[PDB]
Design an enzyme around this catalytic site. Structure first.
Site, PDB file in Angstrom:
ATOM      1  N   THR A  55      43.607  35.187  48.132  1.00  0.00           N
ATOM      2  CA  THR A  55      44.550  34.834  47.173  1.00  0.00           C
ATOM      3  C   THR A  55      44.653  33.460  47.071  1.00  0.00           C
ATOM      4  OG1 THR A  55      44.404  36.947  46.912  1.00  0.00           O
ATOM      5  CG2 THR A  55      46.396  35.653  45.932  1.00  0.00           C
TER       6      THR A  55
ATOM      7  N   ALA B  71      44.295  44.121  47.509  1.00  0.00           N
ATOM      8  CA  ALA B  71      44.207  44.594  45.699  1.00  0.00           C
ATOM      9  C   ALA B  71      45.142  46.334  44.947  1.00  0.00           C
ATOM     10  CB  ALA B  71      43.060  44.816  45.313  1.00  0.00           C
TER      11      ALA B  71
HETATM   12  C1  LIG Z   1      42.905  36.412  48.079  1.00  0.00           C
HETATM   13  C2  LIG Z   1      41.549  36.719  48.018  1.00  0.00           C
HETATM   14  C3  LIG Z   1      42.997  36.964  49.897  1.00  0.00           C
HETATM   15  O1  LIG Z   1      42.633  38.090  50.528  1.00  0.00           O
HETATM   16  C4  LIG Z   1      44.625  37.377  48.214  1.00  0.00           C
HETATM   17  O2  LIG Z   1      44.896  38.048  48.770  1.00  0.00           O
HETATM   18  C5  LIG Z   1      43.435  38.956  47.312  1.00  0.00           C
HETATM   19  C6  LIG Z   1      44.708  39.994  46.652  1.00  0.00           C
HETATM   20  C7  LIG Z   1      43.738  40.305  44.650  1.00  0.00           C
HETATM   21  C8  LIG Z   1      45.683  40.759  44.164  1.00  0.00           C
HETATM   22  C9  LIG Z   1      43.022  41.387  44.820  1.00  0.00           C
HETATM   23  N1  LIG Z   1      43.178  40.672  48.603  1.00  0.00           N
HETATM   24  C10 LIG Z   1      42.096  40.795  48.625  1.00  0.00           C
HETATM   25  O3  LIG Z   1      40.761  40.588  47.489  1.00  0.00           O
HETATM   26  C11 LIG Z   1      42.096  42.077  49.440  1.00  0.00           C
HETATM   27  C12 LIG Z   1      41.849  41.398  50.911  1.00  0.00           C
HETATM   28  C13 LIG Z   1      41.843  42.694  51.328  1.00  0.00           C
HETATM   29  C14 LIG Z   1      42.957  42.135  52.496  1.00  0.00           C
HETATM   30  O4  LIG Z   1      44.443  42.324  53.321  1.00  0.00           O
HETATM   31  N2  LIG Z   1      42.298  41.713  53.732  1.00  0.00           N
HETATM   32  C15 LIG Z   1      42.088  42.626  55.162  1.00  0.00           C
HETATM   33  C16 LIG Z   1      41.990  40.057  53.993  1.00  0.00           C
HETATM   34  N3  LIG Z   1      40.515  42.642  49.255  1.00  0.00           N
HETATM   35  C17 LIG Z   1      41.022  43.866  48.944  1.00  0.00           C
HETATM   36  O5  LIG Z   1      41.557  44.344  48.704  1.00  0.00           O
HETATM   37  C18 LIG Z   1      39.286  44.625  48.810  1.00  0.00           C
HETATM   38  N4  LIG Z   1      39.594  46.216  49.320  1.00  0.00           N
HETATM   39  C19 LIG Z   1      39.991  46.803  50.419  1.00  0.00           C
HETATM   40  O6  LIG Z   1      39.080  45.986  51.182  1.00  0.00           O
HETATM   41  C20 LIG Z   1      40.042  48.281  50.410  1.00  0.00           C
HETATM   42  C21 LIG Z   1      39.343  48.570  50.604  1.00  0.00           C
HETATM   43  C22 LIG Z   1      39.206  49.503  52.298  1.00  0.00           C
HETATM   44  C23 LIG Z   1      39.291  50.483  52.134  1.00  0.00           C
HETATM   45  C24 LIG Z   1      38.424  51.859  53.001  1.00  0.00           C
HETATM   46  C25 LIG Z   1      38.515  45.055  46.956  1.00  0.00           C
HETATM   47  C26 LIG Z   1      39.425  43.819  46.111  1.00  0.00           C
HETATM   48  C27 LIG Z   1      36.999  45.401  47.391  1.00  0.00           C
END
Ligand SMILES: *[C@@](C)(CO)[C@](*)(O)[C@H](CC(C)C)NC(=O)[C@H](CCC(=O)N(C)C)NC(=O)[C@@H](NC(=O)CCCCC)C(C)C
Lengths: 244, 241, 204, 242, 233, 249, 212, 198
Positions: free
Chosen positions: G1, G49
């Site tokens: 993000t 997310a």
């Molecule tokens: C930026 C893309 C950088 O990561 C944003 O912060 C973004 C926020 C929006 C609101 C989606 N975050 C994500 O896409 C997150 C990043 C996960 C994280 O905090 N990290 C460890 C890097 N990605 C997710 O939330 C993904 N889900 C998961 O990882 C949870 C699954 C694990 C449970 C077994 C999904 C969007 C694919």
């Protein structure tokens, strides 16, 4: 079920009076009289035990006067059994306060808490109220000498001079007649004896029937001192006033 | 443990325990409250029955819930301390979760809510207390006056009184208080308060206690000297006629 | 990491002819950082003196606690707590927290008001009572104190004499400890009177 | 004494029936349902002239599409309203949609019999039934404009029109004759005002009576005093006409 | 006499009666009449709905419990909501844990056992509703009768409610007819309509007044209201 | 389940606590017991009223030890006394000995017993205890003491007193005979004479129970070694030891 | 993000990217990282997310409840604290969310609050949050004046995301723009970085490091 | 960590607090007031863990304010500091313990003397002329040892603080973005707004 045997101790009368609070107050009006008078340079507490026997021990006995604290003390009117339960929380409460604020508990905060415990048995739980009235006599760096009273209702008030127990109506009028503000402690000592001596249902007012205390700040030590009069001391002070 | 239903309905449709709680209020000392253009004034009576008291330490009838909002009551004194306390705790909680002192309506509604709750919980009796809640909302200079009662009902009043002989003082306010033009001055508003209690209480130097709440947390209780001056003037008004 | 080793401080008690002596240093630190040169480690409840070393928050708590407990005792019993009895109240109080202890090393000193007998006692963090006729030591330089006392001590010392012995024990022990010192205080106890002296020591 | 939830020899619950008698002492409330909207009216009934009438909240918003009018012991309604709103907003959180008026009503009525003294079944901590009746009005996608009457008995009927409180039986025979399926909203507003005027003790004005409605477009609105005043003026002109 | 033995369900009368249970039974007799009836293929419910005014709605008397089982009510509506819900969970549990359609005979045993616990403990009032439960499990078509005492009875046909004695004599008379109505739902529904009107007195059953439910072999539990019942008037 | 969560002792219009008043009536119906305090000891005594000539009087002890320095006797209901003694012993450990490593002073163990009885006055669903107790004890700082504990929970210190049946006539007898210069042997002599007015039947060490709070008994300790342990001050007299003072009485 | 919000002469600008990742896998290029609490309240999302989406929707509910209860719209300070306090209850369970709550009330005027799962709540004029916050800060700080026009302020917000979308590998997809005024929020479009980059480079002359 | 300094002089206590809030590689704010007013004459500063810091301070604030309303009276600095110490002493042995180091700056209206209290997240309370939490102490404690006299004016106290602040800006690796400075004396709590380029 048990519904049948429930007195319902915490209900109102059609008049808006709490039955149990009233009947407990009626109980106290039979117990020995206690008097508290507050002077400019200290406070006096005195009480009369109901009549007793010669055999009774007077040295070990301290049944109507209690030390709550380094600077707070109480006179009891009613069931001693009930009174000790409350006196024990009162003592714990003060200590809690000291442990927290590193200062001795202000007299009113102590009084309020007990009176709140009493109020409890008035509103919930279906238990009987404590058949106890207290006079409180204490000192703090804020209001100085303080004198309070609390009864089974949970109501408390501040006084310059007060009585609980038997013949309080008669005793209140006599105080209301002889009390003045610029009183010395030793003047208030005399008043409390005279007042008890005039409401006594017994033949004579003797030492073995009396309990006496002062919460006087030392006119040389310059700090607060409590003194529970021992039989011999009361015996001496009773000849002074002219009761032998 | 003890859950016995104390407040219940009766054949005709009343909750007797609440009606009896009201009767406790009717026995309590008289309390009055009137609002001016830029203030609210609270009046209370002190008993004469026992007169060897200590007013320094004896609880006053008017209590601060916050720095800007006060509560007076009629009924059982011991019960009032519970209501006051809860209200003061909620005042602090409110400042902490909303970062803003309570509105008089809100605080009133929460004292009203407690009271109600004791009329349909098992093992408890209703509060033998009606309250007058007065003050000013944060940054607001419009005066507020609210009344609560054992049933938990609340509403706002231009002027109101509760306790013994409140019928006598209410009748006085109903003909003397003008809604079109409220008391314009702080001084003018205190006079109307004392006059109404002077119907009930017998020439009260000690018998009447007055507290004045103004906008922006300006609450100041009146001494026996000040109140005395009002009464001294008020009784001279009659004799001119 | 070691709670007994964060704040520092030492305490020593010693008996003599009709007298006891209890002593402590004034240091309150956090590791290397000297923070307070005033933090006293002796307290008294009536005629019963207690000293505590260890983690200072626990020192402060246990003080407040034993004041709370002795106050209530004196009100129920109508008499002051005695050293023998107090010692027992300290043990049961510590052992109450057996599996989550206070990180302290308490020391008790005083004179039985009834028998006139001098009395000292030592404890571990879970309330094992170590009663001794001669001396008790506590704190981060207990090793240095153990060696000092075991050598300097002789029995039946006079009040004046005992002061010299206990002070020289504490001082030389504190000067081999990085976490003790910064000042010092020594209580000399007699049946009738109690004398409190501050000592002049190295300030490093 | 006697059990709180106890059947009479006739087959009814003593506490519920007595509660129903407490509701007959309350202020009048009227609901009328039309295809243009649902209208809710109440009598304020101030006990003294010093009472500030607009602080009488007998009409409350439950959600943007659901409104509530009460009658009886009104302090008893605070927690029924609180429940209602939380049900509504909670339904929206799980399902991203508007709660059905029908199911919102059903939720409120589920609370109503949770009184007793440590009874069998499921934890019912409440010492007595509610001493209040409710009119719940609103709109949902499926069943359109609806008016429900919610008794403390736990049952709830749907009405085309319903009156609750002191003058309810007289008002009900009146609404019986007046209501038809093709009523406009303005006709319904004036109809509420007419019946309240008839059963009240005071002369009806914009101070001692309060109007509200709920339409699909603007949702649930409580009418300001200046608006209702003009409808009271309009009614008097029409009764005088014929 | 009766004055002292009706305060709660915990107390027995000298004759051996439980008056609180018996007053609960009276609430059913005041309720609106409803009828059940079965053959080997289908089980049927017909219920008369009661309104408050001609401005109020006719409150519903039939509830679905699962895709093969449901019931009709007479008495307190809230108590039917509680009891039908329970059977809905007990039907749900049987499905999730055992992949099983909970049989209607055990449906009744669960309702019997739940109702009984209210008749022996202090504080708890009996339930104030009667139930006519129809099902189609692994052993054909069933119909049950539920009294808030606990007594559940497997029957071919029965009625509960006001004047329900008229309908019960009818079904008693025409046993040999309706039990053989196999394979034709219509002529079983029409047999249940002719049953309920035996319990009518004042009103003629109308299009928003009548409520019909059917379960069976090739039909799942469904509710019929409005212009969908117009053919059976 | 316990539906008795409400008080069974309540206040009557007059200010009486009915259940306590009645409990006290039961105490007057019970067998006489007494207690006398000398300068160097305390004596408690009662009468063993036998339920049947077949019952063995040894198996029933109306006089009981609470701590090595504290003894208890009663008038009233026996079973209530018994369970009180069990609780009185326990409380002396839990609330004192497990804290201070010594036994509670007489006045404090009384205080604990009083409290247990007071709760029976106020708790949900209980009647008060139907007993008055006499507690006799010694502690290093108070000397010898004698206390009376009523069903209400109240307690009074006594030079001498009796409770139960002939308590009125016995208190009159004690007032004649008690002084502040009594030795413990004398106090026993008076006790036997005072109990003689109560007893109609056999008067011997078989039908009279008596115990003292006197000197430390080293031979009753059970072990030698610790110089600060000198043995219990509570001593129950044997059937034979009683008869020795009755032969010249 | 990458997400940002700042305060200026004519209200609040709010801009976010639209990318979600699972490690180095680009999970989505079309995520809505702005929750519309009500006509006057906005929340931004960064970190986990689900944690953001779930609790900020829960926040929406809590605010509606305040409206119904208090007959008034919730203040920005208060709304931020409902989330801030919830998040602190969970402190240590491993919630992961850096949030901004922006809105207008008469009492407060334009107001921005930063709230993170550490349980940190801060009031300020300028905030950038997420993996690519530093890249946004570079462009944002160096061109910020209080007295920017609404047109210029909107552009700078858009540009600041683009800068981060470019450099940060865990940012991109598209830019979502908002403007908060006295009258509430105004949505100002969804701008695909795929077309925006080449538009901006051409029109502005910037991004000279790139071939094309 | 954050910079938290306090100094008591003749008639007042002075508190100085770092203005920076830093998370990770970014300075999120350069104007943070790391203080809460507990009562008209008692002020508390705070430094420690990200969340616990404000949540503890605001919690202590509610309790002292609730106390003042209930008693219509202001607790002495000694009494407030004791209350705080115990809250932290309670915390340390719990599931998730408060991680906050505080300074209490108070003027006892009854005693007419200023008072300063240092208490760490353990509840280690000590009264001091001058005090510091965290790494800041390693520089200031020795500077103040040298330059401090107990009879100093509020004016002389501020000069002495600037000299502490100059030393930290010179030697400490962190940019803490200066300090917000407050005076606690007989007239209440006031803020020295122009400390930036004083
Ligand atoms: C930026 C893309 C950088 O990561 C944003 O912060 C973004 C926020 C929006 C609101 C989606 N975050 C994500 O896409 C997150 C990043 C996960 C994280 O905090 N990290 C460890 C890097 N990605 C997710 O939330 C993904 N889900 C998961 O990882 C949870 C699954 C694990 C449970 C077994 C999904 C969007 C694919």
């Amino acid at each position: 079920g048990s519904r049948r045997y429930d007195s319902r101790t915490t209900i109102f009368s059609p008049e808006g009076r709490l039955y149990q609070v009233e009947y407990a107050l009626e109980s106290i009006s039979h117990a020995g009289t206690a008097i508290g008078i507050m002077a400019s340079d200290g406070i006096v507490l005195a009480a009369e035990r109901k009549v007793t026997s010669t055999l009774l021990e007077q040295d070990t006995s301290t049944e109507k006067l209690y030390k709550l604290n380094d600077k707070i003390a109480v006179a009891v009117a009613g069931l001693t059994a009930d009174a000790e339960i409350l006196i024990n929380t009162a003592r714990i409460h003060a200590q809690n306060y000291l442990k927290t604020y590193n200062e001795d508990i202000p007299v009113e905060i102590l009084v309020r808490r007990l009176s709140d415990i009493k109020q409890g048995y008035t509103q919930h739980g279906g238990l009987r109220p404590f058949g106890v009235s207290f006079i409180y006599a204490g000192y703090d760096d804020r209001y100085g000498y303080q004198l309070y009273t609390s009864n089974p209702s949970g109501n408390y008030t501040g006084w310059k001079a007060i009585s609980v127990g038997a013949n309080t109506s008669a005793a209140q009028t006599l105080l209301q007649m002889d009390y003045k503000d610029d009183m010395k402690v030793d003047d208030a000592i005399e008043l409390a004896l005279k007042t008890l001596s005039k409401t006594t249902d017994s033949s004579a007012l003797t030492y073995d029937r009396l309990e006496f205390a002062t919460i006087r700040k030392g006119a040389n030590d310059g700090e607060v001192y409590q003194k529970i009069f021992k039989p011999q001391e009361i015996k001496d002070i009773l000849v002074k006033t002219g009761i032998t | 443990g003890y859950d016995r239903a104390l407040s219940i309905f009766s054949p005709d449709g009343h909750i007797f325990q609440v009606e009896y709680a009201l009767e406790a209020v009717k026995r309590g000392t008289c309390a009055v409250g009137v609002k001016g253009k830029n203030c609210v004034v609270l009046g209370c009576e002190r008993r004469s029955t026992l007169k060897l008291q200590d007013t320094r330490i004896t609880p006053s009838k008017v209590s601060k819930i916050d720095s800007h909002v006060v509560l007076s009551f009629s009924g059982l004194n011991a019960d009032s301390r519970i209501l006051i306390e809860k209200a003061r705790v909620e005042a602090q909680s409110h400042r902490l979760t909303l970062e803003d002192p309570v509105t008089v309506e809100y605080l009133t509604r929460y004292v009203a809510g407690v009271q109600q709750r004791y009329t349909q919980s098992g093992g408890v009796r209703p509060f033998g207390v009606s309250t007058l809640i007065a003050g000013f909302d944060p940054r607001d200079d419009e005066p507020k006056l609210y009344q609560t009662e054992p049933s938990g009902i609340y509403s706002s009043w231009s002027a109101q009184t509760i306790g013994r002989n409140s019928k006598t003082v209410r009748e006085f306010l109903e003909k003397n208080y003008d809604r079109k033009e409220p008391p314009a001055t702080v001084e003018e508003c205190v006079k109307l308060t004392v006059r109404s209690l002077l119907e009930v209480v017998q020439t009260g130097a000690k018998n009447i206690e007055i507290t004045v709440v103004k906008p922006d947390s300006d609450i100041v209780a009146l001494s026996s000297e000040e109140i005395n001056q009002y009464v001294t003037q008020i009784e001279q008004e009659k004799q001119e006629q | 990491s070691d709670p007994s080793s964060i704040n520092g401080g030492i305490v020593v008690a010693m008996t003599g002819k009709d007298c006891v002596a209890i002593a402590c240093d004034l240091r309150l630190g956090s590791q290397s950082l000297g923070v307070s040169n005033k933090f006293e480690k002796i307290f008294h409840y009536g005629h019963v003196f207690l000293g505590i070393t260890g983690l200072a928050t626990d020192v402060t708590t246990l003080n407040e606690m034993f004041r709370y407990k002795t106050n209530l005792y004196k009100l129920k019993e109508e008499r002051a707590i005695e050293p023998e009895t107090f010692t027992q109240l300290v043990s049961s109080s510590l052992y109450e927290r057996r599996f989550g202890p206070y990180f302290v090393g308490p020391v008790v000193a005083g004179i039985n008001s009834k028998s006139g007998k001098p009395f000292i006692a030592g404890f571990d963090l879970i309330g094992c009572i170590d009663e001794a006729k001669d001396f008790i030591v506590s704190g981060t330089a207990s090793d240095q104190l153990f060696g000092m006392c075991e050598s300097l001590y002789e029995p039946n010392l006079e009040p004046e004499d005992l002061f010299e012995t206990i002070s020289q024990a504490l001082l030389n022990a504190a000067d081999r400890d990085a976490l003790s010192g910064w000042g010092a205080v020594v209580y000399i106890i007699k049946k009738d009177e109690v004398v409190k002296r501050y000592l002049k020591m190295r300030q490093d | 004494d006697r059990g709180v939830s106890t059947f009479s020899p006739e087959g009814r619950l003593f506490q519920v029936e007595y509660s129903l008698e407490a509701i007959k002492l309350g202020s009048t409330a009227i609901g009328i349902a039309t295809k243009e909207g649902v209208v809710l009216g109440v009598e304020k009934r101030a006990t003294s002239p010093l009472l500030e009438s607009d602080s009488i909240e007998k009409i409350v918003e439950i959600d943007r599409h659901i409104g509530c009018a009460m009658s009886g012991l009104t302090a008893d309604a605070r927690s029924m309203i609180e429940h209602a709103r939380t049900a509504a907003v909670t339904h929206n959180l799980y399902y991203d949609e508007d709660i059905n008026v029908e199911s919102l009503t059903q939720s409120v009525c589920d609370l109503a019999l949770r009184f007793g003294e440590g009874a069998s079944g499921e934890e019912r901590l409440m010492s007595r039934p509610f001493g209040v009746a409710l009119l719940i009005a609103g709109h949902d996608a499926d069943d359109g404009y609806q008016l429900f009457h919610a008794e403390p008995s736990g049952t709830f009927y749907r009405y085309n029109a319903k009156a609750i409180g002191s003058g309810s039986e007289g008002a009900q025979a009146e609404l019986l004759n007046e209501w038809h399926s093709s009523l406009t909203l303005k006709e319904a507003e004036l109809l509420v005002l007419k019946i309240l005027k008839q059963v009240m003790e005071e002369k009806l004005d914009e101070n001692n009576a309060q109007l509200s409605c709920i339409t699909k477009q603007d949702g649930f609105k409580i009418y300001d005093n200046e608006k209702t005043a003009e409808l009271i003026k309009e009614l008097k002109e029409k009764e005088a006409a014929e | 006499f009766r004055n002292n033995y009706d305060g709660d369900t915990v107390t027995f009368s000298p004759t051996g009666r439980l008056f609180q249970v018996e007053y609960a039974l009276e609430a059913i007799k005041q309720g609106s009449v409803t009828v059940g009836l079965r053959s080997n293929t289908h089980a049927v419910l017909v219920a008369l709905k009661r309104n408050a005014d001609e401005l109020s709605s006719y409150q519903k008397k039939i509830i679905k419990c699962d895709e093969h089982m449901g019931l009709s009510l007479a008495g307190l509506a809230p108590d039917a909501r509680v009891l039908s819900n329970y059977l809905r969970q007990q039907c749900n549990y049987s499905s999730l844990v055992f992949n099983r359609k909970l049989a209607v005979e055990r449906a009744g045993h669960l309702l019997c056992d739940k109702a009984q616990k209210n008749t022996q403990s202090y504080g708890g009032r009996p339930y104030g509703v009667g139930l006519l439960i129809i099902g189609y499990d692994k052993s054909g078509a069933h119909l049950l009768e539920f009294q808030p005492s606990g007594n559940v009875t497997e029957l071919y046909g029965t009625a509960i409610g006001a004047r329900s004695q008229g309908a019960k004599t009818y079904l008693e008379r025409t046993l040999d007819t309706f039990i053989k109505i196999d394979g034709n739902p219509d002529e079983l529904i029409k047999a249940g309509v002719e049953a309920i009107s035996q319990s009518l007195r004042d009103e003629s059953l109308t299009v928003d007044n009548l409520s019909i439910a059917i379960v069976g072999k090739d039909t799942p539990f469904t509710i019929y209201d409005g212009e969908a019942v117009a053919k059976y008037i | 389940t316990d539906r008795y969560s409400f008080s069974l002792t309540t206040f009557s219009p007059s200010g009486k606590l009915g259940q306590i008043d009645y409990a006290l009536t039961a105490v007057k119906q019970g067998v006489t017991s007494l207690g006398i305090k000398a300068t160097n000891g305390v004596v408690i005594a009662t009468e063993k009223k036998s339920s049947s000539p077949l019952a063995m009087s040894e198996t029933l002890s109306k006089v009981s030890l609470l701590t090595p320095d504290i003894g208890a006797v009663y008038s009233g209901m026996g079973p209530d006394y018994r369970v009180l003694v069990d609780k009185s012993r326990k409380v002396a450990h839990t609330s004192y000995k497990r804290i201070y490593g010594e036994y509670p002073p007489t006045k404090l163990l009384v205080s604990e017993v009083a409290k247990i009885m007071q709760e029976a006055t106020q708790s949900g669903g209980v009647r008060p205890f139907g007993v008055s107790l006499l507690i006799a004890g010694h502690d290093e700082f108070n000397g010898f003491s004698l206390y009376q504990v009523d069903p209400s929970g109240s307690y009074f210190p006594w030079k001498a007193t009796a409770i139960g049946k002939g308590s009125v006539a016995a208190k009159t007898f004690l007032e004649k005979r008690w002084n502040d210069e009594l030795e413990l042997e004398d106090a026993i002599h008076i006790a036997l004479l005072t109990l003689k007015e109560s007893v109609e039947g056999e008067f011997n060490g078989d039908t009279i129970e008596l115990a003292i709070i006197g000197d430390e008994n080293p031979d009753l300790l059970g072990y030698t070694g610790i110089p600060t342990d000198k043995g219990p001050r509570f001593r129950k007299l044997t059937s034979q030891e009683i008869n020795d003072r009755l032969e010249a009485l | 993000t990458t997400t940002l919000a700042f305060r200026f002469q004519g209200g609040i600008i709010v801009a976010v990217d639209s990318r979600a990742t699972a490690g180095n896998w680009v999970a989505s290029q079309t995520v809505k990282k702005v929750i519309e609490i009500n006509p006057f309240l906005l929340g931004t999302m960064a970190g986990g997310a689900a944690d953001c989406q779930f609790w900020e929707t829960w926040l929406g509910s809590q605010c509606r409840l305040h409206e119904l209860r208090e007959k008034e719209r919730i203040s920005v300070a208060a709304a931020s604290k409902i989330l801030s306090n919830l998040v602190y209850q969970y402190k240590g369970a491993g919630l992961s969310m850096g949030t901004m709550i922006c809105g207008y009330t008469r009492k407060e005027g334009p107001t921005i609050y930063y709230v993170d799962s550490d349980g940190t709540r801060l009031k300020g004029d300028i905030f950038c949050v997420g993996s690519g916050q530093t890249f946004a800060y570079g462009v944002l700080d160096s061109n910020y004046k209080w007295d920017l026009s609404v047109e210029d302020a909107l552009y700078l917000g858009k540009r600041s995301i683009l800068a981060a979308a470019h450099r940060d590998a865990y940012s991109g997809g598209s830019v979502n723009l908002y403007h908060v005024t006295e009258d509430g929020w105004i949505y100002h479009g969804n701008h695909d970085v795929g077309e925006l980059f080449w538009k901006v480079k051409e029109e502005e002359g910037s991004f000279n490091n790139v071939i094309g | 960590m954050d910079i938290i300094l306090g100094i008591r002089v003749q008639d007042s206590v002075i508190l100085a607090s770092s203005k920076a809030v830093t998370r990770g590689i970014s300075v999120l704010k350069d104007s943070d007031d790391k203080t809460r007013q507990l009562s008209p004459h008692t002020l508390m500063s705070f430094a420690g863990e990200a969340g616990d810091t404000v949540q503890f301070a605001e919690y202590i604030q509610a309790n002292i304010q609730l106390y003042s309303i209930r008693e219509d009276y202001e607790l002495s600095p000694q009494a407030v500091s004791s209350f705080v110490r115990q809250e932290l002493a309670k915390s340390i042995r719990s599931r998730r313990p408060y991680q906050v180091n505080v300074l209490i700056g108070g003027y006892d209206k009854k005693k007419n003397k200023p008072e300063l209290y240092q208490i760490d997240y353990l509840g280690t309370k000590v009264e001091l002329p001058y005090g510091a939490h965290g790494y800041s102490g390693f520089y200031t404690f020795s500077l103040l040892d040298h330059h401090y006299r107990p009879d100093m004016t509020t004016e002389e106290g501020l000069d002495l603080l600037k000299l502490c602040v100059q030393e930290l800006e010179k030697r400490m690796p962190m940019d803490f973005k200066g300090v917000i400075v407050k005076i606690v004396d007989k007239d209440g709590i006031r803020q020295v707004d122009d400390f930036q380029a004083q």
